[PDB]
Amino acid sequence: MILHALTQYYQRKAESDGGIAQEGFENKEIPFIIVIDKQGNFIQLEDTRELKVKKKVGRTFLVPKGLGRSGSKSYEVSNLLWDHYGYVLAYAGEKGQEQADKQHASFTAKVNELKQALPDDAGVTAVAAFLSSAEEKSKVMQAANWAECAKVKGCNLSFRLVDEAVDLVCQSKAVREYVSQANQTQSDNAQKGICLVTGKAAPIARLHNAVKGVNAKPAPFASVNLSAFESYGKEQGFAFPIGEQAMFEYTTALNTLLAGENRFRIGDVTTVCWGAKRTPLEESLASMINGGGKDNPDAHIDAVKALYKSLYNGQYCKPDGEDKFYLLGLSPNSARIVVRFWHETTVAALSESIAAWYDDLQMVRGENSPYPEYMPLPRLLGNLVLDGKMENLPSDLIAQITDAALNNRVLPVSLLQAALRRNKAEQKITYGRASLLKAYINRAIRAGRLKNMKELTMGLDRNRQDIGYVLGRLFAVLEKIQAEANPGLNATIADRYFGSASSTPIAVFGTLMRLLPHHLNKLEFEGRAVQLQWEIRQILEHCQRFPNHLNLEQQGLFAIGYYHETQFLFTKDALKNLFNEA
């Protein structure tokens, strides 16, 4: 199902007119297309480049498929009419001649044996007269932009004769048919059966085709080539007898999705997501749709793309799915492709890890809270960072919190450590440090990494007995009383006592609570002083002694307890109510 779900959208995108390589071809990224006249005579070396900031090498021309050269005598293979600045010009940037001239001795051979088998084309007779020139090819090096194709190793030049103007020599409706004939005769006399993917006879394809976009080089996604990965003496592709017509389909299915908008990194794991076979598009809804509705394979991938993007957008919505999205989360090994994810499941089922991420991360917010309901990871991790989210450690943090969030894994200790660092370093617990600590501690509980404690809740737990959480609440009420006593404070007992009330409660809370009677005295509403003192009595009723030192477990609680109680105090009528029910 890993590949029959790729074959079964090649057969969908090839039938949704989405423009996928048709049965013999490949959307190869040809950077430095060659222009020739009708009888040779190199005209121009156009570069079909200029895309995303790393100038990806060429407009994807859907040219005859890359033949997977890959060998010591790699020169013999010679892709049909597009290959290489070493195959087209015999120019070796770093490979040396006789490893580029023998390439050109075979690329010219390939073109010519095409020309004999495909005459009166004026496109291949042109290039076959351009590949029997040795001078116009020399003129290719003396081109205006040749110096920029020599810069890109493995440049793929291809032969657009002039007077076709978009259509390559390998695009004419004879080379197009030749490839549709050279992938229907030569790749049909091979090992007769039987398909792994489709199950049909469909002659077996040894050498699956170089799935591009995963690795540093197009690597054969399914490729058993070492002395023992071969199971039954099957030798490299008969270990997995996938037909040529099916091998091509899923290879060019990955190739487009790793080159399309389907590709997106879940985290450090480039993933191709495509909608499964959509339901028959119930009649009423299909009444308005013309055709009617078509199963565009990559249609609602956004639902899943904007699910993992929701972890950074903070725009997570609990989804109701039943629209199943294939999500093949491949990743490079070295030059194999490691399927790290495979999910035919719905986006609702995929969300169960981000939902648990944004439910373990749920934290109290008052009214008109400037904080998002589900707080974006970059803005969430920005509460761990020095002052702006780029220095949060790209290996135990932003790159691992995401893996701990995308997968409902345990948030690393490096959050308590980092979130606590910032709690007592910014001298305040931003929503985002309280929320992130709530997520850490909830998952530490759920993993049995935080044994005695019970999972935190959104709200303040006017309970919880936790010698760190209740002192966090105590600090929250103490600082609320101070900020209620002195509205404009320059050094709240946060900014002055937090670093040691969080981590060392006897050092401080024995002296915060001498400031406390004075703060209560200064409350202009003495009844408000009574209410706040009542709740600090309630808070401190759960406390039997300020601990000498708060474990890393509880300084997270302190921060969570602080934020819980401080958003309880800044609730509409919470303290007035809770006081009035006593």
């Binding site: 009423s284 809804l285 009444s287 308005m288 749709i289 013309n290 055709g291 009617g292 509705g293 078509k294 609602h300 956004d302 639902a303 793309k305 904007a306 993007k309 957008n313 725009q315 997570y316 919505c317 609990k318 989804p319 109701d320 009214e367 008109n368």
Partner: protein, 181 residues
């Protein structure tokens, strides 16, 4: 009530734009705005464009922010959109919700940015509040007909042989223009 727009008059008076006539006039205006295209279709988003303006909370914000009978920034676009998606049709409802929930936040995506799928699913409480406002005092129950059978006409009066998908966005923006205009 309900106070669609609270204009502090130049004479230090306050005039109230009745949401009744605000929605009525917007729908009538973006019924001529669309020709054979969405004449009675864009109005059904004109009727609904500020349904969330019926919010009991927003009728406490538009007063607070515009100084009518003496700061929260209460969303109101999404409520009309959710009302549409539940009442007309999963197709027409979302069609109309693009227009409605975008009418101030800008036209929204379904998934990626400012996603409607998120806002509608989160509009349930907001729609409940705004529809409670709508039913609470005034606005006869057949003020929002949302007659899908009639609304099916100008859709099919324009989409002869069904709705082209690759250019259904052009209404979603042209009829959006009718609403926002």
């Amino acid at each position: 009530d309900y106070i669609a727009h609270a204009r502090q008059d130049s004479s230090n008076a306050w005039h109230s734009h009745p949401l009744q006539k605000h929605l009525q006039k917007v729908a009538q205006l973006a019924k001529r705005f669309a020709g054979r295209y969405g004449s009675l279709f864009a109005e059904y988003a004109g009727l609904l464009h500020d349904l969330g303006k019926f919010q009991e909370s927003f009728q406490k914000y538009i007063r607070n922010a515009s100084g009518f009978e003496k700061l929260r920034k209460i969303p109101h676009s999404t409520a009309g959109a959710k009302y549409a998606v539940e009442r007309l049709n999963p197709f027409f409802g979302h069609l109309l919700a693009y227009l409605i929930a975008g009418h101030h936040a800008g036209l929204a995506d379904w998934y990626d940015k400012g996603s409607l799928k998120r806002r509608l699913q989160q509009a349930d409480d907001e729609l409940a509040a705004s529809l409670s406002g709508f039913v609470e005092s005034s606005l006869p129950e057949d003020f929002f007909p949302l007659s899908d059978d009639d609304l099916m006409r100008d859709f099919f009066a324009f989409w002869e042989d069904g709705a082209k998908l690759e250019e259904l966005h052009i209404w979603m923006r042209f009829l959006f223009s009718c609403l926002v205009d």
